[PDB]
């Protein structure tokens, strides 16, 4: 258990756990609060409380202090059982990807929301863009898929095997999409928070807009400073190309995709017609 905290990549991880253990067994503070102050992520908190309990029993700690740890562990299992299972099952993978305690917890939170949520492909893509968009988005996705594999490999996966298999296929589509969306960098660079990352998330939003119309693309253009006629045409042309290459599975459905692309084309043509 103590060795598992090496995955935080905190040079004082071990000392911190031992200090926390002493504080927990001292029995003044609320176990859950103390654990959360020491380590981010319920997975690390759960493991720390478990470590303290085992030590406390062997060390012959106060029965009341031990009981408080048992209650805390039981509360966490009841409220966050699947999340903790997901974290435990994927710790080696998460450890290999994360470079700090915050990055570890961050990865676990992303994995939790995907694995245990009911997110559409678009919302999953948006989640990944928000967290990893201007960092190692492809590394994050590859690690998430490794995590899905380690979860399914475990004796008790965090959710059903059928769902984990579907999620691996979903995340492949997200990886294809994330690659396509890199074109937003070049587009913003050519034309000159409404940055490239913002545009990527804007396009993903558009992919689930069943009420999409050409007017929405005008507002997008305005948001991104493509106001002059030439830049407006170039921007709308770029956006349509990117939307077109975005995998069909990202869109709310095939019909919404068709509407989006027809609207994007019309917005482009309207701008061209002004020239
Ligand atoms: Ca004794
Ligand atoms: Cl289509
Ligand atoms: Na990878």
Numbering used by the authors: 83 to 274, 281 to 363
Excerpt from the publication:
We have solved the crystal structure of BopN of B. pertussis and show that it is similar to the structures of gatekeepers that control access to the T3SS channel from the bacterial cytoplasm.
To obtain a stable protein fragment of BopN suitable for crystallization experiments, we performed limited proteolysis of the full-length BopN protein (BopN 1 to 365) of B. pertussis Tohama I by trypsin. Residues 69 to 82 are not visible, probably due to conformational flexibility or partial degradation. A kinked helix 6 (residues 162 to 180) connects the N-terminal domain to a central domain consisting of parallel helices 7 and 8 located on top of helices 6, 9, and 10. The C-terminal domain consists of parallel helices 11 and 12, overlying helices 10, 13, and 14. It is connected to the central domain by a shared rigid central helix 10 (residues 243 to 274) and a region (residues 275 to 281) that lacks density in the electron map, indicating loop flexibility. When the BopN molecule is superimposed on the structurally characterized gatekeepers, the overall shapes and orientations of the X-bundle domains also differ, with the most noticeable difference being the realignment of the N-terminal domain of BopN.
